[PDB]
């Protein structure tokens, strides 16, 4: 198989570990449990090609800014993640996460991922952002952000319902082949 390394970054509690675990195990995790460093792997066929996909979960907290780059060497594709129901995490894509990827791994494909897709329509969650004077991220806002940071694709997915989850990772491989 062809080894392909993918690193997932993004603000804390945007859904990275769930996104990662849900894809490889088809099981949603139990408790929250913020991550410090985790390595996963999965073998999938994309366009008839056998790929040994290496996945590197990262800590979204600032306290681990010195730690996160340790997983970056030899990365083939990056996954910058924000939450479709946390406009602050969307703003950190251009503020923190794209400049960080750019600084360490220039000329490395980036896919911007929209997480927690099922919560943008869940009314019980839409009102809770009204009180905070915030509104969910629309598709066009993300696609505009994608071409701004020069990302290959803009994809929306949900780890809980797995809608569009398999697309995020198929597209990540095609950006490498």
């Amino acid at each position: 198989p062809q080894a392909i390394k993918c690193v997932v970054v993004g603000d804390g509690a945007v859904g990275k570990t769930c996104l990662l675990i849900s894809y490889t195990t088809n099981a949603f995790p139990g408790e929250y449990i913020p991550t410090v460093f985790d390595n996963y792997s999965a073998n999938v066929m994309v366009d008839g090609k056998p790929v040994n996909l290496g996945l590197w979960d990262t800590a979204g907290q600032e306290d681990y800014d010195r730690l996160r780059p340790l997983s970056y060497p030899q990365t083939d594709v990056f996954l910058i993640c924000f939450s479709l129901v946390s406009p602050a995490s969307f703003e950190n894509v251009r503020a923190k996460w794209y400049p960080e990827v750019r600084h360490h791994c220039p000329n490395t494909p980036i896919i911007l991922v929209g997480t927690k897709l099922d919560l943008r329509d869940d009314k019980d969650t839409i009102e809770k952002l009204k009180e905070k004077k915030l509104t969910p991220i629309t598709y066009p806002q993300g696609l505009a952000m994608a071409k701004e940071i020069g990302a290959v694709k803009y994809l929306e997915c949900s780890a809980l319902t797995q809608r569009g989850l398999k697309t995020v990772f198929d597209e990540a491989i095609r950006a490498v082949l």
């Binding site: 410090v36 460093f37 985790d38 792997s41 996945l55 340790l70 060497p73």
Partner: protein, 141 residues
């Protein structure tokens, strides 16, 4: 008994050997003479270029120590310019997805973290290495 092997090892380490910590402060053999040996095993250290260096790993309290063979004696490891003595204070361990004989070691430090990849002879050995280090860190003050 384990302290017996510890002492024998210490005498096989060269006198003028040293290694540089991330904060620039230098760690020398003299500082190892006080220590209690927990575990010792032959492992391989994977370099950034994918090479494997022959290593003798010594799990102590309060640190982890990597050694190389200089003919008949031992020296501190000089691999990829990383510190060859790791403080157990905020040390964690993870398993390598690519290989079940391998483990990641990330040592948080005062000048910032640092990552190590170590391959053992079997998955049982890796597993034993992890919980042994896990328990040393737990009982390290």
């Amino acid at each position: 008994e384990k302290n017996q092997k510890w002492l024998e090892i210490l005498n096989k380490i060269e006198n003028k050997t040293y290694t540089k910590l991330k904060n620039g402060h230098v760690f020398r053999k003299q500082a190892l003479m006080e220590r209690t040996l927990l575990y010792d095993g032959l492992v391989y250290w994977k370099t950034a270029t994918g090479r494997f260096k022959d290593i003798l790993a010594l799990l102590l309290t309060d640190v982890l120590l990597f050694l190389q063979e200089k003919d008949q004696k031992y020296i501190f490891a000089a691999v990829d310019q990383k510190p060859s003595v790791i403080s157990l204070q905020k040390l964690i361990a993870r398993e390598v997805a690519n290989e079940e004989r391998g483990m990641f070691l990330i040592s948080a430090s005062s000048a910032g973290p640092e990552m190590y990849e170590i391959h053992t002879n079997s998955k049982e050995e890796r597993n034993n290495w992890m919980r042994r280090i896990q328990q040393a860190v737990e009982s390290c003050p």
